[PDB]
Paper text:
Many folds, spanning all levels of complexity (fibrous, solenoid, toroid, and globular), clearly originated in this way. β-Propellers offer an attractive model system to study this process. They are toroids formed by sequential supersecondary structure units of typically 40–50 residues, each consisting of four anti-parallel β-strands. The units are arranged radially, with their strands perpendicular to the plane of the toroid, and have a right-handed twist, hence the name ‘propeller’ for the fold and ‘blades’ for the repetitive units. Since none of our single-bladed PkwA constructs were folded, we turned our attention to another highly symmetric β-propeller of the WD40 family, found in the C-terminal part of Npun_R6612 from the multicellular cyanobacterium Nostoc punctiforme PCC 73102 and referred to henceforth as WRAP (WD40-family Recently Amplified Propeller; ACC84870.1). WRAP, which we identified during a systematic bioinformatic survey of β-propellers, was particularly interesting in that its 14 blades are practically identical, having acquired only 10 point mutations over 563 residues (6 of these being Trp → Arg mutations at the same position of blades 1, 3, 6, 10, 12, and 13), as a result of 13 non-synonymous substitutions at the DNA level.
The 4- and 5-bladed constructs assembled into homo-dimers and the 6-bladed construct into homo-tetramers. As we anticipated from their oligomeric states, the 2-bladed and 4-bladed fragments formed 8-bladed propellers and the 3-bladed fragment a 9-bladed propeller. Instead, the packing of the blades within each fragment preserves the geometry of the 7-bladed parent, and the tension due to the mismatch between the number of blades in the assembly versus that in the parent accumulates at the interface between the fragments. The one formed by two 4-bladed fragments absorbs the tension at only two interfaces, leading to an even more pronounced oval shape and a clear two-fold symmetry. This latter construct, unlike all others, also shows considerable interface variability between the propellers in the asymmetric unit of the crystal, resulting from the two halves being shifted to different extent in the plane of the interface, further highlighting the inherent structural tension.
Residue numbers in the entry:
A (entry chain A): 0 to 166
B (entry chain B): 5 to 166
The structure:
Amino acid sequence: AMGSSSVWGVAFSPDGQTIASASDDKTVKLWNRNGQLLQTLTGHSSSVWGVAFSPDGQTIASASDDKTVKLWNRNGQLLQTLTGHSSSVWGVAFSPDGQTIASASDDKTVKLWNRNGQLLQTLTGHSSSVWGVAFSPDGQTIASASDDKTVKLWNRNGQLLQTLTGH
Amino acid sequence: SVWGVAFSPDGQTIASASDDKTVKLWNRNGQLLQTLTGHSSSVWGVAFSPDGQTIASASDDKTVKLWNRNGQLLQTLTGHSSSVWGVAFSPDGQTIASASDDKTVKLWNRNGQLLQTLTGHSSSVWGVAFSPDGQTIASASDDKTVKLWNRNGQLLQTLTGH
Ligand SMILES: [Zn+2]
Ligand SMILES: [Zn+2]
Ligand SMILES: [Zn+2]
Ligand SMILES: [Zn+2]
């Protein structure tokens, strides 16, 4: 049971029957495998950059230029808005159980959240915009990638474990 | 920039594309275990097989290399005409998919044989993934599209950004 992340540019649902895509109009669209539109997720007030399905398949996360991450159910309903980043959010990922969300922001931080929208941790250390984030299968360990040309590995108590590329 | 890190199935090994033409294997505590040496240019993408025993690496040298977990080079997959950015294993581990600057995705077996070339993206393909059942392949491109393909290399659908 792996995490799910926006970093590969594809967000299949766990059964592969639904696919989520960031649209060019501040929306996320859900499609079936035949290219038919199922849901438009409306609510972001600026560009949507990253999307992920929870491994539960019931929740979708979207990262936006409007500095928020939004959580949606599969039937298109907005569930939560995760606020706290001070700049664009580029990337979003779910832990393998779907109960933790990680967000990667232009504000140089990764933030970790629960599904009720509560901020759990801020990972600070990157000297530049953080564009990518992903969980380990153990669900304890997090990788982030930044324009500072480094990749950092963290615990979910927010301690830096290693800088894997770069310095 | 593309994503350069992959987890083993249990999370106890982490592969990362290094800035020195190598892949490095780390344990979960950040300790270096192995360096995979052999690519002749930058390494951009890595993946683990579902059994955790094979690692794939995608390189600016236009190849994908397959390695065992103890650091030994198993195969070099040759055929892309430009940088390879991304690499993925199918859920059964028997197929490898590669995403290239040459605007194609290629599908390979573990013995290094080219099975299919997926053409249709109008620009560099940076990301590729299999569906969970392994019957559909998804690719993401600088042409701002995501395309869904079957295993025979037929384009099924394009998500366009509308
Ligand atoms: Zn260096
Ligand atoms: Zn790009
Ligand atoms: Zn449109
Ligand atoms: Zn449009």
